[PDB]
Amino acid sequence: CPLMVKVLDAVRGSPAINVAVHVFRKAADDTWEPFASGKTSESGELHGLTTEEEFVEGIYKVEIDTKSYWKALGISPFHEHAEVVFTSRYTIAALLSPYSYSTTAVVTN
Amino acid sequence: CPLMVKVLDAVRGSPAINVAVHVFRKAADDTWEPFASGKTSESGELHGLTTEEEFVEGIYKVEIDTKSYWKALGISPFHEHAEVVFTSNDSGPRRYTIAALLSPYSYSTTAVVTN
Amino acid sequence: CPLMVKVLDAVRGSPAINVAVHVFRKAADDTWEPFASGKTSESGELHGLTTEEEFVEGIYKVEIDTKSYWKALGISPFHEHAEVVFTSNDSGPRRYTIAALLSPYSYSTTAVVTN
Amino acid sequence: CPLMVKVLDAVRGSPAINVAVHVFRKAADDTWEPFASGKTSESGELHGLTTEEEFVEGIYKVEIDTKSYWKALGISPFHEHAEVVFTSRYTIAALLSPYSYSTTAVVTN
């Protein structure tokens, strides 16, 4: 798999577990088409979203449902989600706080 | 002025100047409607985007054109832009500062919400 | 005033108020000598730490007491403090803003250096 | 090993390779005693710094030599190093830019 998503919780110092992640690809008609989705594991990682064959050149959006994550912990956060948009191994990492997030791409191989 | 945007450059240690910023509001048909826009100043700040009267409760998106900024500096970037999506909340008086710190392969955004 | 410190709270989305900040300068015997200190204001900013005349080229450490801040909010933190160590450089006129964004298990610090 | 250090480069979107890391422990006389050191690998990770037996309760400082890293890439950075100070699995992660860094602790098991 050429795409992995890793989510960390900066309040608890832990992986962010069971976070929903949705991936979209921009279609020829300029709309966002749903591409893949999943939930982070106990390690905060989401593997297997796609394959080398399916992950063609294009514009991709990774939407991380941070709001549901914080609300399940009792926290009303600022952001609706964390959005990562890029043109195409990619690791998309997100570090979450209730009123802040950071995202980093690590691109290897 | 209930909404300000501030952008910093983590490579040069400087305000990120002349960065395009677009604000959208989610419409009833679930599309994003352009709302306001501008360019960051020499202090990296964008003031005057909206008014207390216009900035009603709703879902907003602030799109920061980071890719064009890094292209102007000759540094290859990862992201097309930085997007900040939030629901505003008129429970008490509020001012929103959306702060973004930019690196070519990383950004962070923070909301500073004050009375 | 060539050196300012600004601290934000990523959990509450607010300036980090009443945070103790200590500045040190490296002495000839390689020890850290206290130089200046204060507490952040209601805007999360600490002004007036030093003067252009006092702030000569050297190695400085800015220590932000993040642990006491999180203890006051009742949130268990990881770090004892946030430390920012840098060499100042009087090649042209400069102002230094040391900005820190605090979470209980994470912080980021950025230098904004302007003419 | 109860302590791992991971360093990422936010300019290139890559692990930060061959970064020097020094660990100190505060002694009873209130001085910093050198505890362990190493260099990050091709994955940006530094494993094996210590053992469960050696990593007793105490105050630790992890000093990451970011200045040498940037200077080897032609960049004159702001910070002399990134310092992480904490009282005691710990993963200390640092994300580096020339005028900014972030550090996050991920504490598991």
UniProtKB/Swiss-Prot annotation, chains A, D:
Effect annotated for changing V11I: In AMYLD1; late-onset amyloid polyneuropathy with carpal tunnel syndrome
Effect the entry attributes to changing A36T: In AMYLD1; amyloid cardiomyopathy
Keyword entries, A-Z: Amyloid, Amyloidosis, Cytoplasm, Disease variant, Gamma-carboxyglutamic acid, Glycoprotein, Hormone, Neuropathy, Phosphoprotein, Secreted, Signal, Sulfation, Thyroid hormone, Transport
Effect of F24V: In AMYLD1; amyloid polyneuropathy
Phenotype for A94T: In DTTRH; increased affinity for thyroxine
Record PTM Phosphoserine, positions in chain: S43
Tissue specificity as recorded in UniProt: Detected in serum and cerebrospinal fluid (at protein level). Highly expressed in choroid plexus epithelial cells. Detected in retina pigment epithelium and liver.
Effect noted on mutating K61N: In AMYLD1; amyloid polyneuropathy
Effect of V21M: In AMYLD1; amyloid polyneuropathy; by far the most frequent mutation
Reported effect, G38R: In AMYLD1; amyloid polyneuropathy
Effect of substituting G38V: In AMYLD1; amyloid polyneuropathy with carpal tunnel syndrome
Effect of E80Q: In AMYLD1; amyloid polyneuropathy and cardiomyopathy
Variant or mutagenesis effect after changing I75N: In AMYLD1; vitrous amyloid
Listed result of changing V62A: In AMYLD1; amyloid polyneuropathy
Origin: domain of life: Eukaryota
Effect in UniProt of substituting A82S: In AMYLD1; amyloid polyneuropathy
Domain remark text: Each monomer has two 4-stranded beta sheets and the shape of a prolate ellipsoid. Antiparallel beta-sheet interactions link monomers into dimers. A short loop from each monomer forms the main dimer-dimer interaction. These two pairs of loops separate the opposed, convex beta-sheets of the dimers to form an internal channel.
Additional record remark: Tetramer dissociation and partial unfolding leads to the formation of aggregates and amyloid fibrils. Small molecules that occupy at least one of the thyroid hormone binding sites stabilize the tetramer, and thereby stabilize the native state and protect against misfolding and the formation of amyloid fibrils. Two binding sites for thyroxine are located in the channel. Less than 1% of plasma prealbumin molecules are normally involved in thyroxine transport. L-thyroxine binds to the transthyretin by an order of magnitude stronger than does the triiodo-L-thyronine. Thyroxine-binding globulin is the major carrier protein for thyroid hormones in man.
Protein's recorded name: Transthyretin
Organism: Homo sapiens
